[PDB]
Amino acid sequence: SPQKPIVRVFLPNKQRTVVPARCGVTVRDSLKKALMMRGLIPECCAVYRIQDGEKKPIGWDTDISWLTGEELHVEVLENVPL
Ligand SMILES: COc1cc(OC)c(/C=C/S(=O)(=O)Cc2ccc(OC)c(NCC(=O)O)c2)c(OC)c1
């Protein structure tokens, strides 16, 4: 059934957006909107999601429709954060 699923991304500065689980869409497209909805840009950010007290670094080329229902984190790449 054509349901509208969503995945919420925590933007930089501890904000949070929500994007539909865009099928055939990479993180970059979906969450570049996410940045722009805060007024930010996808250039200076990285995308990785916090799991069990840990971090699972996602790829900007990752298909976002697999990350549905799961909240992501976008963290500013300042001086290459590990
Ligand atoms: C900060 O930048 C953004 C922040 C947003 O939010 C904080 C939204 C979007 C909010 S939203 O409410 O439209 C998400 C959304 C979509 C579909 C849903 O069901 C199908 C539901 N269901 C739960 C509910 O209705 O609350 C929620 C944003 O969108 C581009 C950008």
UniProtKB/Swiss-Prot annotation:
Record PTM Phosphoserine, positions in chain: 1
Known tissue expression: Brain and testis.
Domain of life: Eukaryota
Post-translational modifications: Ubiquitinated by RNF149; which leads to proteasomal degradation.
Compartment(s) of residence: Nucleus; Cytoplasm; Cell membrane
Domain RBD: 5-77
Subunit structure: Monomer. Homodimer. Heterodimerizes with RAF1, and the heterodimer possesses a highly increased kinase activity compared to the respective homodimers or monomers. Heterodimerization is mitogen-regulated and enhanced by 14-3-3 proteins. Heterodimerizes (via N-terminus) with KSR1 (via N-terminus) or KSR2 (via N-terminus) in a MAP2K1-dependent manner. Interacts with MAP2K1 and MAP2K2. Found in a complex with at least BRAF, HRAS, MAP2K1, MAPK3 and RGS14.
Annotated disease: Defects in BRAF are found in a wide range of cancers. Colorectal cancer: A complex disease characterized by malignant lesions arising from the inner wall of the large intestine (the colon) and the rectum. Genetic alterations are often associated with progression from premalignant lesion (adenoma) to invasive adenocarcinoma. Risk factors for cancer of the colon and rectum include colon polyps, long-standing ulcerative colitis, and genetic family history.
Protein purpose: Protein kinase involved in the transduction of mitogenic signals from the cell membrane to the nucleus. Phosphorylates MAP2K1, and thereby activates the MAP kinase signal transduction pathway. Phosphorylates PFKFB2. May play a role in the postsynaptic responses of hippocampal neurons.
Homology family: Belongs to the protein kinase superfamily. TKL Ser/Thr protein kinase family. RAF subfamily.
The protein's name in its UniProt record: Serine/threonine-protein kinase B-raf
Species whose genome carries this gene: Homo sapiens
Taxonomic classification: Eukaryota, Metazoa, Chordata, Craniata, Vertebrata
Gene: BRAF
Shown residues within the full chain: 151 to 232 of 766
